[PDB]
Point group: C2
Chain length 118, copies 2
């Protein structure tokens, strides 16, 4: 029913409102594949509920001080967002600004893949 442009707009709006979990629950495909930019073993994730667990883990391990979302930028079945996060990881305790691009693939109205570039 909704077009990629509408899905992209709603999802981005939700993230700008800081409603990351609502955005994910609403739009992620049951089998969403998520690919972190950082090299390593748990970079790749499969499954909507797995991703929710990873997202909760990430919130428990970072203090988010602020941030912005720019986009959506659309091309065909995908949209890109540009994220800037002001965060203190518990792992380091050293405040940093993270700058990345997320690329979201949409099929049948659900995000089937998210890939982050850093």
């Amino acid at each position: 029913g909704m077009t990629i442009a509408e899905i992209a707009k709603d999802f981005t709006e939700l993230l700008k409102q800081g409603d990351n979990a609502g955005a994910a629950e609403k739009y992620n495909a049951d089998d969403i594949a998520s690919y972190e930019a950082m090299e390593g073993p748990m970079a790749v994730s499969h499954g909507k509920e797995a991703l929710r667990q990873k997202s909760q883990w990430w919130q428990e391990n970072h203090e988010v001080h602020g941030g912005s979302v720019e986009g959506p930028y659309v091309n065909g079945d995908q949209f890109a967002l540009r994220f800037k996060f002001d965060v203190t990881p518990k792992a380091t305790g050293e405040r940093v600004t993270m700058d990345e691009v997320g690329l979201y693939t949409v099929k049948n109205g659900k995000i089937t893949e998210e890939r982050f570039y850093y």
Copy 2:
């Protein structure tokens, strides 16, 4: 008042029996630190609930095909276990054998740190 030997034996038996969640809830300190060997997205974790999420994430992304837990091996305030198990990560769909050593630090009856060696 449980000795390290007692805690170690109970925790090990629980892991051998497959009660990973029970061992974690019974013994992990609220501020437990978990360190993978691999660098990567969930390589360093802090908090008991964070570890529960990481652990659920891991379970959802791997099929475990058996294996064994050897130990506990004790010295002072710590114990070590050796884990050898076949697993199929959802990311690759290719079955591999994992062989790792876990080192557990106990303070006031609770596991304050777990550290994995690969």
